[PDB]
């Protein structure tokens, strides 16, 4: 395929500029749940009337790397232009050629984002840009390391923009570079620590495990869910193998960053050989629309025993993951676990679709109350993964509301 198409696939511009399965590709209109609210993606197809067909190379590069449209207004940081600023000029012109010469124009205005005051005006953004230290010399070949190291760095920081989610944001929602690749709450989900820390990060992960995780998102110790589900199903699964090798090579070289209260790797937790009591549901017979079954084991077997066995080691063939020794349950922060319970996991790789059902109020399988999530996550956490964390009603209700509210969001009141 063309260089521009590969560059767009690597940069994952398609996932955020497509409104789901429908919503013809690269027409924007897909809402990002930023702390200020819904930011609607713009249509990027070369349409002369409603698109960016009137865009020229300098304006395209400006919008791609420094966040200015043709009219002159600033683009919201929801565009990852802070990490997208470092592609070389050959890459930006390749994306130019791919956009105007390889995607069909579509004549459909995208929804206009309406932000609450004082974020309604998109003009104060220059102050945030200068305060965030985005510029930004284009990338150059570092000759201290080998070619694969530089290529992995290029994909990680420039194209795949891992730091967009795996690097925590400071008070101004700017990239806090000090904790490089240390994880952050990105809403209902949390990107975990991925540095070379043997316990907090992915330093202890085997090379084949990281390669399989980056190519498919499915391995014995971790499954890509939520933002990784979309990221892998849109950007990495089609990406060639050598670039995955470069990526893992670089991730094996990033400096370490430790998390609070970690002692073993998130995939190194043993399981308690405990289960429910079958007899207890004899008192619960002829007792439909369960509200009285409050015990953690009874709920666990009521909803989750089918896929993850009562032992918590999942399927023999591996389709149902081993909850024991799994990073999502083995992480100290149950935000991955709570988000998995609330929204399930949906990941389409090689036209084959992983899907674990959501257990939020809008579930079709078993819509179950928030206290039930809390007790179930507590049982899962104590018995099979990291027993040092807790899950309460408030945390799950917060994730239901869309993650913890950043302080800046209170200014829109």
């Amino acid at each position: 395929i063309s260089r521009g198409h590969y560059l767009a696939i690597a940069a994952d511009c398609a996932a955020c500029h497509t409104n789901g399965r429908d919503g013809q590709f690269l027409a924007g209109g897909y809402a990002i749940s930023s702390p200020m609210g819904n930011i609607y993606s713009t249509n990027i197809t070369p349409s002369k009337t409603h698109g960016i067909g009137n865009y020229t190379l300098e304006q395209f590069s400006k919008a791609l790397r420094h966040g200015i449209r043709a009219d002159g207004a600033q683009l919201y940081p929801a565009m990852p232009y802070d990490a997208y600023n470092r592609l070389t000029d050959e890459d930006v012109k390749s994306l130019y050629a791919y956009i105007m010469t390889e995607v069909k124009p579509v004549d459909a205005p995208s929804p206009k984002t309406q932000l609450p005051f004082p974020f309604s005006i998109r003009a104060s953004l220059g102050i945030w840009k200068i305060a965030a230290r985005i510029e930004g010399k284009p990338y150059v070949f570092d000759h201290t390391h080998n070619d694969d190291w530089n290529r992995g760095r290029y994909l990680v920081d420039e194209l795949a923009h891992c730091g967009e989610c795996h690097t925590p944001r400071n008070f101004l929602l700017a990239p806090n570079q000090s904790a490089y690749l240390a994880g952050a709450d990105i809403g209902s989900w949390r990107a975990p620590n991925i540095t070379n820390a043997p316990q907090s990060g992915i330093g202890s992960w085997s090379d084949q495990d990281l390669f399989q995780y980056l190519k498919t998102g499915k391995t014995a110790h971790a499954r890509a869910a939520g933002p990784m589900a979309e990221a892998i199903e849109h950007s990495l699964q089609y990406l060639p193998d050598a670039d995955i090798s470069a990526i893992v090579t670089y991730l094996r070289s990033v400096p370490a960053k430790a998390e609070s209260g970690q002692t073993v790797a998130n995939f190194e937790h043993a399981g308690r050989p405990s289960s429910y009591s079958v007899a207890n549901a004899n008192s619960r017979r002829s007792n439909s629309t369960l509200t009285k079954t409050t015990d953690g084991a009874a709920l666990y077997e009521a909803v989750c025993a089918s896929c993850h066995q009562s032992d918590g080691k999942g399927s023999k063939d591996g389709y149902y993951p081993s909850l024991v020794g799994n990073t999502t349950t083995g992480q100290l922060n149950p935000n991955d676990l709570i988000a998995s319970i609330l929204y399930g996991v949906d990941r389409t790789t090689d036209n084959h679709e992983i899907l674990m059902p959501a257990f939020g109020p809008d579930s079709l399988v078993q819509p179950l109350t928030d206290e039930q999530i809390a007790t179930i996550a507590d049982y899962v956490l104590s018995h099979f993964g990291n027993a040092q964390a807790t899950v309460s009603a408030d945390a799950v209700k917060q994730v239901r509301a869309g993650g913890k509210q950043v302080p800046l969001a209170k200014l829109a009141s």
């Binding site: 009591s277 079958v278 007899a279 549901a281 004899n282 017979r285 025993a305 089918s306 896929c307 066995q309 009562s310 399927s315 023999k316 063939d317 591996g318 389709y319 149902y320």
Partner: protein, 136 residues
């Protein structure tokens, strides 16, 4: 404890399978003594018989006790350990599932109805032969 320990020992001898869940045993003995008060005397008598006659397996024990009064209790404890139930009514109490012993000899092929086997498409493979005892 001593009653329950002898209970799990007699069940291991009668079922012939060493791996039995302890909670299932304690609970089955509780239901058993609930149904009849003199279950402890019967189990001590049965253990005495198996020890004195030096019965190696439950097969010879059953063959040599076809008419004695303690055959029904042994048959019924075996029934409770396998089926997981004691009574014969539709409202009886179920004391063990997914660990009841009838589902074990056909576990690898026949799926335990509410617990999933390996993967969403396992039945594409040919099954194991019927003449091999898998495990347990």
């Amino acid at each position: 404890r001593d009653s329950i320990s002898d209970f799990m020992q007699l069940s291991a001898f009668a079922t012939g399978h060493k791996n039995l869940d302890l909670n299932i045993g304690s609970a089955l003995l509780l239901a058993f003594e609930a149904q009849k008060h003199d279950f402890s005397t019967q189990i001590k008598a049965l253990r005495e018989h198996i020890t004195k006659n030096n019965y190696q397996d439950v097969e010879a024990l059953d063959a040599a006790m076809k008419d004695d009064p303690l055959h029904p209790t042994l048959i019924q404890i075996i029934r409770a350990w396998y089926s997981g139930v004691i009574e014969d009514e539709t409202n009886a109490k179920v004391y063990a599932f997914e660990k009841a012993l009838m589902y074990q000899p056909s576990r690898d092929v026949v799926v335990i109805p509410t617990y999933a086997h390996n993967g969403p498409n396992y039945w594409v493979s040919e099954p194991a032969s019927v003449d091999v005892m898998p495990a347990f």
